[PDB]
């Protein structure tokens, strides 16, 4: 059958595996990457944000971006043939059509990649725990680039695809959401930093508990992929950390499962918190301390200090960060400390 | 041969927890810093950190929770001056000026430094390779940067990272407004180090778990397929490499477990090394990239970028941080 | 001053790392296990259990 | 007649310690928000 | 500090219930 013939070709052993998932992955991923490279090189953001964001305009690698569509577009798909662009490619770029282009094709790209992980794992004969782990980056992408702006007024308040643009997104979430005070980001931080810890401490331990399987000072040559023996001493590695740290791994399988668990769980937790922020459901305040501080002008914590910083961030960045609001702040209304 | 008996017990490998000569310094200092931290975090009175007679409450008994609680840095009036208990007229004065902060971090930094050395020591006693401590130098340098190096460059321990959750956030926000740490290539390498670390950790974890050789059934944990100290490897690297080598291309995958694990150590350690040096170099005010008003049109109008938006956010933190501590237009200290 | 202070602090730190690296290895090399653990003479295996 | 699909349940000491740690730390984190 | 009156009971149950669940599972394992 033609289906079986095509299946043979798609699953051919090549330098770059394709598979059925390749029909979805490769074009979408190529357009997402290409769309970003195109926009950050030529396309501007002058009509959407009032910002320059391409090499053609004078921006560097850190400042270039594919910016979000104007707030007036709402949650429009902004299709090229859509009622906004009306088939005009030039107008389409000027309206922010490339952002949705990247976001959407990038979304189905991530779907194609996770499918690719399933497909290859099925052909090889291994468990699909790599695909499962990849659910955490997806949950992050979906919550932040799709769900969060959908919860808000428009795509405008989604992250713009750029280095400095992301930094804007970071500081925005501090000033407006107090995202640092949210326990769901905290669990994410613990997962990322904890993942980096596990990654560093595992590689270091293994490398420093190696068996002597060679005569050379560089021990990389003393390994063979088809060997049946462990290359490092689990026993010696166990005693070391038992005396240094108090506890230690005794089971290799639980160790590498835990290395999956920590950063994946963290990202999923941070994803949940973003979903909340989409509705402005923030961990912004502690009511108990606001009651105290409002009644007692001598009560002060690092928490009340950070809120003053958020108030500063908001009032000072909003007019330019949200040009569609037409904010006009007279100098006398700006929150300022002494001298500065 | 009596002092020899003491030396043997200190360097003994049969202790549940290894002591060692580094531990001879580590154990008292860590206990000192820990005990003082627990007491101060709970029952310490407010502290005038900015040295402007504006005490900041940090303990639980004075209206804080776990999230807002902190041990507050020593007074700005103190600066880099050494401030032990016996330099104060009373414990009340010592507590008012942020005494506990210096006591803890100094005992801690000493203890932590000996902790690293202690890691080398046991590895030498066991016949291991000694570079695990080198990996621990990455977070240790990071602690040294925010607790010691940055206060030095700025001239006060009041600008050190507070011993608290919210206080930590305060440290980050003020830092960005003054150094633009986000637009600094060393923090960016740090982000790449911890994101990549978490990625590779999830990556290595998933590939090894996926290539686990069946030794168990469906009615029991797969972990019981491994026994502690067994000769055979619990997974198949050949199969694992076969998978990841097709996920991308084979020459983008590791077939060498030693080379793979080294990369697992190298990437996040080097990354954290840079972000450590980032704080350390920005301590002497070599700040992040400044592209404010870099783009200009033909007439001369400033065409804003995302950098200028970042600037507006930094302005907001700057003019509000320590609202009473500034008397002059330029923030230098 | 900013140039001179930052540059040499970077160098100073890495040289400390260089100290730790070359010192530990010197110890191991002089003792005879810088290239790994002898499979048929693992020190831990001859040591008693911690518990 | 007994049910042949029944199975014993286990939880070793290590899983207990890990589990208790997960709970105690989650408690320490979220308690502040409960009291608010 | 004027905190939530349910903060104490919600925190106590959040600790006790799942931790008890674990303890129960452990003791019946060592007895096996």
């Amino acid at each position: 059958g033609w289906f079986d013939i095509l299946d043979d070709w798609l699953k051919r052993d090549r330098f770059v595996f394709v598979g059925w998932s390749g029909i979805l992955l490769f074009p979408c991923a190529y357009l997402a990457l290409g769309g970003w490279l195109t926009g950050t090189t030529f396309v501007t953001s002058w009509y959407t944000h009032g910002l320059a964001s391409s090499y053609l305009e004078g921006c560097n690698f850190l400042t270039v971006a594919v910016s979000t569509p104007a707030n007036s577009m709402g949650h429009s798909l902004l299709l090229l043939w859509g009622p906004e662009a009306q088939g005009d490619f030039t107008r389409w770029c000027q309206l922010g059509g490339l952002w949705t282009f990247i976001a959407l094709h990038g979304a189905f790209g991530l779907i194609g990649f996770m499918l690719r992980q399933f497909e290859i794992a099925r052909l090889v004969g291994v468990r699909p725990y790599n695909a499962i782990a990849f659910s955490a980056p997806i949950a992050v992408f979906v919550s932040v680039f799709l769900i969060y702006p959908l919860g808000q007024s428009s795509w405008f308040f989604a992250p713009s695809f750029g280095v400095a643009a992301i930094f804007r997104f970071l500081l925005f979430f501090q000033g407006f959401h107090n995202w640092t005070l949210n326990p769901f980001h905290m669990m994410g931080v613990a997962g990322v930093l904890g993942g980096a810890l596990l990654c560093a401490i595992h590689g270091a331990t293994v490398e420093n508990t190696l068996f002597q399987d060679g005569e050379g000072a560089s021990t990389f040559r003393a390994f063979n992929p088809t060997q049946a023996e462990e290359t490092y001493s689990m026993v010696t590695a166990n005693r070391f950390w038992s005396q240094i740290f108090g506890i230690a791994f005794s089971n290799k399988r639980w160790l590498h499962f835990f290395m999956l668990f920590v950063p994946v769980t963290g990202l999923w937790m941070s994803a949940i918190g973003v979903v909340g922020l989409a509705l402005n459901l923030r961990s912004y305040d502690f009511i108990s301390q606001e009651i105290r501080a409002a009644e007692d002008p001598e009560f002060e914590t690092f928490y009340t200090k950070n809120l003053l910083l958020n108030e500063g961030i908001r009032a000072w960045m909003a007019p330019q960060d949200q040009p569609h609001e037409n904010f006009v702040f007279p100098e006398e209304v700006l929150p300022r400390g002494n001298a500065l | 041969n009596l002092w020899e008996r003491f030396c043997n017990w200190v360097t003994s490998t049969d202790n549940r927890l290894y002591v060692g000569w580094f531990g001879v310094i580590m154990i008292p200092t860590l206990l000192a810093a820990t005990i003082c931290f627990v007491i101060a975090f709970i029952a310490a009175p407010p502290v005038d950190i900015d040295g402007i007679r504006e005490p900041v409450s940090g303990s639980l008994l004075y209206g804080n929770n776990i999230i807002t609680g902190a041990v507050v840095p020593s007074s700005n009036a103190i600066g880099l001056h050494f401030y032990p208990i016996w330099e104060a007229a009373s414990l009340d004065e010592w507590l008012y000026n942020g005494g506990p902060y210096q006591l803890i971090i100094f005992h801690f930094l000493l203890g932590a430094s000996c902790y690293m050395g202690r890691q080398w020591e046991l590895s030498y006693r066991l016949g291991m390779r000694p570079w695990i401590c080198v990996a621990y130098s990455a977070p240790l340098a990071s602690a040294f940067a925010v607790f010691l190096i940055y206060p030095i460059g700025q001239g006060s321990f009041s600008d050190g990272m507070p011993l608290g959750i919210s206080g930590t956030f305060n440290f980050m926000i003020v830092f960005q407004a003054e150094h633009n740490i986000l637009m600094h290539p060393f923090h960016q390498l740090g982000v790449a180090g911890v994101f990549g670390g978490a990625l590779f950790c999830a990556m290595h974890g998933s590939l090894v778990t996926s290539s686990l050789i069946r030794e168990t059934t469906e009615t029991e944990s797969a972990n019981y397929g491994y026994k502690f100290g067994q000769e055979e490897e619990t997974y198949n690297i050949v199969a694992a490499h076969g998978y990841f080598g097709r996920l991308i291309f084979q020459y983008a995958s590791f077939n060498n477990s030693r080379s793979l694990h080294f990369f697992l150590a190298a990437w996040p350690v080097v990354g954290v090394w840079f972000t450590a040096l980032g704080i350390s170099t920005m301590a002497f005010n070599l700040n992040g990239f400044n592209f404010n008003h870099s783009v200009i049109d033909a007439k001369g109008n400033v065409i804003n970028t995302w950098a200028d938006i970042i600037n507006r956010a930094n302005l907001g933190m700057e003019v509000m941080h320590e609202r009473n501590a500034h008397n002059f237009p330029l923030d230098l200290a | 001053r900013s140039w001179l202070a930052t540059s040499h602090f970077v160098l100073a730190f890495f040289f400390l790392v260089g100290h730790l690296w070359h010192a530990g290895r010197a110890r191991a090399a002089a003792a005879g296990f810088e290239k790994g653990i002898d499979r048929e003479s693992e020190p831990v295996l001859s040591m008693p259990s911690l518990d | 007649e007994p049910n042949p699909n029944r199975q014993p349940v286990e939880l070793n000491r290590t899983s207990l310690y890990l589990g208790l740690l997960l709970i105690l730390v989650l408690a320490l984190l979220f308690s502040s928000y409960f009291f608010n | 500090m004027e905190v939530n009156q349910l903060g104490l009971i919600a925190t106590a149950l959040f600790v006790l219930v799942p931790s008890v669940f674990l303890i129960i599972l452990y003791v019946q394992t060592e007895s096996q």
Binding site: - | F228 | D51 | Y17, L20 | -
Partner: peptide, 29 residues
């Protein structure tokens, strides 16, 4: 009462450390 709760949890964690180290499940070869 908030303080007592916070300290109690912290105390339990420290206690858990003691049992997870000195009264752990001994690894056997």
């Amino acid at each position: 009462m908030e303080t007592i709760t916070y300290v109690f949890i912290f105390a339990c964690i420290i206690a858990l450390f003691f049992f997870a180290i000195f009264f752990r499940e001994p690894p056997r070869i």
